[PDB]
Design a protein around this ligand. Structure first.
Ligand SMILES: [Cl-]
Ligand SMILES: [Cl-]
Ligand SMILES: [Cl-]
Ligand SMILES: [Cl-]
Ligand SMILES: [K+]
Ligand SMILES: [K+]
Ligand SMILES: [K+]
Ligand SMILES: [K+]
Ligand SMILES: [K+]
Ligand SMILES: [K+]
Ligand SMILES: [K+]
Ligand SMILES: [K+]
Ligand SMILES: [K+]
Ligand SMILES: [K+]
Ligand SMILES: [K+]
Ligand SMILES: [K+]
Ligand SMILES: [K+]
Lengths: 396, 395, 397, 395
């Protein structure tokens, strides 16, 4: 990875993360993505939106978004019609795999300026009617919830990912109480970062014009919802009685987008750009689909080896909190202390727009490294179907 | 491009292309994709399915296919659960961009064996109900056709691709008659290739469990040519003065196609015999309603990346989204039809949109062998304004 | 009694062919079928104009997406004056017969002199329902509800199909799969024999379907020809696998069709010098436990006979609507009515069961059976989902 | 013919569209009104009711025979004869007429008749799933528009027929707004004076997930009057020049109402005290789009069938399908508004179409009691060109 051309991150930006049918539910996935792309580019002194050559953008539940969500994000952000645009689906890892592909396109010399990231509007995922073309002569028919079908259900076993999270808790010995106390801790971290202004730089607030007064959405919607007594008292979500996974200690359904701007070494010099960070390496891994929860335990070492960096040298990790048990299990398998993980809180408290989260956690990681005066960061995100993606950055 | 690691195609395969609601409509997109991947790997002596490290697979209309169509394609083909899988959507160019991404992943050293391609089941694209979560208190509502919404409608103009085809005919001066005679010629070429056995190698027949079992061996569309009916049919998108018709356009279709890519080091380690070498590629884009002529940008870009002159190409595959698309790109690039789509194109063969980018590459490798060519170029336009192109050398 | 009230005569009747589900008449809406039967029945009355019709009662069960007031649509479609009073009637399977009863009563209270009554059903064009689109449903798969199942064939109380309750009737009164299959065969044969002899030609009004250029004509009922005894005795049970006795071939099908009768008061009959086909002697509705609707005609039939002052032995022909073969079997046993006097030209198991129309359909057929077999007194009885039944006694003139 | 007596009557509160009663189905509302009216009759058991006629227009997804569900939910015997009647907006009154006829022909001694409608729970329709639609966007039909508010011949909503009525007889946006404001204030004054308390049976909606219990006692619509907002709201059906608006029209509503009828002989046998006696009725019809003025035919028909003069009626309930409907009918019959809808009308109270025919008859008896009157008449127009009218004498 050192024998390959350098890839610099010159900026990043994210929408606030809205709740399901909540503050951003009126916006489509390309509207969210355009907002993030435009806000990331506005931060780069000396780089124009017309300089962007290629876009990779993650998006999972693309039904009814229209042709090529990434293209719609790029044009909506004001990029040139000459821009090459590709939508990426690696379920929950989409937004990070998009960034990997953008880096590679710089490395093979086919671009010098790339925007990559991801977007998801789970609020605007439709329902499906699958048999209208051939007809169904007689009998009740099903309207398929696109979130469940294309976002949250493992294709092999037809099992919701929350059921496989329960499998993870049983496999690795994590109780209801260990998961709940993790969830409270990560909500408290997200609230603390919010209150301290530590998301202000990375978030681009959204202005919703009134149809009626305008509305400005500035903060992530979920963190303020923590109620520790109710969190500890709620019923399980997937297994009655003996269940350990709950709605409060799991990720929610959410709307949001995030974007990074990548440039080659040559373009960084030509335009005299100030780099925020360097991409040191990455790794994808996969295992049995129902064990997707611990695929980051393969991807993270793979990315660290690609980067030539030891695990102990990392100053901060972003382990995406698909569920509280996912963070607990990868911390246990890798031997990573929680005091190095999701220092501004994670998806259980912040939200999980699935096509965007892989880029969202990288944006947040750069903020964590700056706030905590760190240098080396690693983001790792599991995905439905058994996979995970991971990436190592150096703050400059 | 020549200063980066070499990428070899060690095999390729495709399903037959089925008609809309036709011979393959009982199969899902991952079932077609798995079939193509498995058939491509079976052709490589000395390479096991367990050697495949990563998959990139195109798919456009992914609604109701379930999580990660490419992952389902990979597992259904018998690949290991360790395999990295990413689904790609660049509309009609998805299958070719997937192959580009696979090649890049070998070039950056992150894989030595990659399967890439694409799949589409347009038969099984659903309809959508968009406002059931928040409700709609009063008034008639709509069920959105997923093919129209996510496959065939330009987002900015909200116009179907046939109307962009008419823009192409007006912008580059191709009449109804010119488009029809082009369409007849490409159906004739596809039928001739069919009868001469020239698709037998690339196609992996599909066995449908039975009633007794049905085997689908042929592409469904080529036989439908009726020249008298084609010249007489009413235009499909503009009454009276229109030039684009259903016969002279690509149809809606089902199918998949796959290539197997290896690094130079792995080729030597496993003593594999390569079919072709990837020489270069290029993506380009312009005004979305003008996507029809984006190949006139992408093809020269791919040739420059490959370090190959246009005159040295022995055969081109220019995807026939419409007959007028091939006519316009041939005119703009100065490519004679005698070098284009030598076994016919998508107007006659079919156009499963997420697969066609890989489908035309598989067919191109067959054309280079049959016609004793060495250098080939595939170029495919895509809704939204883009095109992708790729240059190969037959070994 | 009835004799203290004005007389009510039937001067004509007519019915469409009964089409199969998604079959020969699937292109026609329920009011198109109803208008066709109304026009045909009126064309048969010498001396009576369509403008003479004052009020219409018409049955229709699955009215979803039919539009405002199906009976008004049937009446205006048939060329009746816009001054016509029109009411649609839903007593599920009994709708067509209760409409005729309400029509008779409206003459008897002196509010009309010429009434057209009947029923119609297009089960092919029954839609699916999206029940919760107004308020939304935030998350989860949802249901598209089959309107035939919901509004036509499911008991509201137990929320179970009528077939499963036909299965319950079989266990209650001791009728086997073989006993139901052998009945089904016999009524299919009576239906085929009646078709072959042309005994349906008078009552049926053939339907023309416009072509490009010539016209397709539906002249025959669609279901009778489908009898296959080998397949019938060998088919899997429809509701209870293994031990079930109710099957699709021995049950009534889903069907499209309509039927109509014209009623006049005694004054109009002589004021217009009309030849009356039959006189309405009495009628009777009854109801019991919803899941036991199958034997409800066993209450309604004797109640109708009593209202009409007529004995059960005096009846020359019975029409007992064959919702299921066991429905006809059980009511024959309960009342002690021999099959030799029941559904002599076949019943709904072979002819079809367009549910809103069948109560009028069996009356039209009953009039034809009395003419053919040279009887004078007839009784039609039809059960309906929910526990009820309706019955009517006529005298052929 | 035998005399027919009203021994009681009851109605639910009239809920707003998707409002205070939206959680209840049409049979639950109907059962509530039936058993409430039967509770008012001392000496008459619910087991004494032999037959039920209940109006209901938009019956889709209500289940088998709405009237039967109303009867059984109200505690009536399974032996009860139950028929659902649809004469659109006149269903609730035509049901009552059919029940009186069933007593007059001596087939019943105790009949419950009325109407119910849950417009909140009217579904949308998918009409072509059985045969399918191969390619194209499709429609979901709003059952309220299709089966309730659209004339079948002209395919136009009732509001456009109301604009016809305005240009037919000369009633401006200001005249209709003035009437709407007047009927709203008569409704609000009756609420404050308790004049709806006897007829309305409140509904208990208990929440037991920790939620608190909710009792609906008031009609939801009368309080919504805002004359400033009303006068300045844009037209509803004809932009700029129309005269019909949502405030001056009836809303969409949920509600039910029932009457208990008995024969002359049963009144004497059970020693019951009759509230009123049905004197006569009349149905009439004309051009479907001119249904607005159809009460101008049925109201005289009902007065003549009953042997009562128009100058002899103490109070009229002319159902306000639109404010212009009341104004037009008053003009053609020459009826002073000081004898019309003395507690308000459907423009302010609400219009559950299948129930309103019984609802206005219930409110009429409360008018005749409060105003100390003897003869009341109720007329109600219905879609399709018809109207129903009924004449009562308070006892
Ligand atoms: Cl995966
Ligand atoms: Cl594009
Ligand atoms: Cl019943
Ligand atoms: Cl009418
Ligand atoms: K900038
Ligand atoms: K900011
Ligand atoms: K949570
Ligand atoms: K092999
Ligand atoms: K080998
Ligand atoms: K082959
Ligand atoms: K074609
Ligand atoms: K005649
Ligand atoms: K005939
Ligand atoms: K049958
Ligand atoms: K009582
Ligand atoms: K009360
Ligand atoms: K109002």
């Amino acid at each position: 990875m050192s024998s390959l051309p350098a890839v610099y991150i010159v900026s990043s930006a994210r929408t606030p993360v809205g709740s399901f049918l909540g503050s951003l539910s009126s916006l489509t996935a390309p509207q969210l993505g355009a907002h993030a792309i435009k806000a990331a580019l506005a931060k780069v002194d000396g780089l124009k939106p017309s300089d962007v050559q290629e876009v990779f953008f993650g998006n999972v539940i693309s039904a009814n978004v229209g042709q090529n969500p990434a293209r719609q994000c790029a044009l909506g952000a004001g990029l040139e019609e000459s821009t090459i645009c590709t939508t990426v689906n690696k379920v929950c890892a989409s937004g990070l795999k998009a960034i990997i592909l953008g880096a590679q396109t710089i490395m093979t010399g086919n671009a010098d300026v790339v925007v990559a990231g991801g977007t998801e509007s789970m609020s605007n995922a439709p329902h499906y009617l699958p048999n209208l073309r051939t007809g169904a002569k007689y009998g009740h028919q099903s309207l398929v919830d696109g979130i469940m079908k294309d976002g949250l259900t493992d294709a092999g076993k037809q099992e919701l990912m929350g059921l496989q999270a329960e499998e993870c808790a049983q496999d690795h010995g994590f109780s209801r109480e260990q998961q709940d106390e993790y969830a409270i801790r990560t909500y408290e971290k997200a609230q603390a970062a919010q209150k301290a202004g530590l998301f202000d730089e990375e978030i681009a607030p959204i202005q919703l014009p009134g149809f009626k007064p305008d509305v400005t959405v500035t903060q992530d919607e979920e963190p303020k919802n923590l109620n520790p007594e109710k969190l500890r008292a709620i019923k399980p979500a997937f297994i009655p009685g003996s269940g350990t996974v709950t709605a409060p200690n799991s990720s929610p359904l959410n709307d949001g987008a995030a974007a990074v701007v990548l440039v080659s070494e040559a373009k960084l010099k030509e335009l005299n750009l100030k780099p925020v960070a360097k991409i040191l390496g990455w790794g994808d891994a996969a295992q049995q689909p129902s064990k997707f929860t611990t695929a980051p335990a393969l991807a993270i070492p793979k990315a660290l080896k690609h980067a030539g960096v030891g695990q102990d040298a990392i100053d901060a990790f972003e382990i995406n909190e698909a569920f509280s048990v996912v963070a607990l299990a990868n911390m246990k398998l890798l031997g990573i202390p929680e005091e190095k993980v999701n220092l501004h809180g994670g998806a259980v408290a912040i939200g999980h727009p699935i096509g965007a989260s892989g880029a969202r956690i990288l944006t947040t990681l750069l903020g964590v490294l700056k706030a905590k005066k760190g240098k080396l960061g690693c983001a790792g995100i599991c995905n439905g179907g058994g996979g995970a993606s991971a990436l190592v950055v150096e703050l400059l």
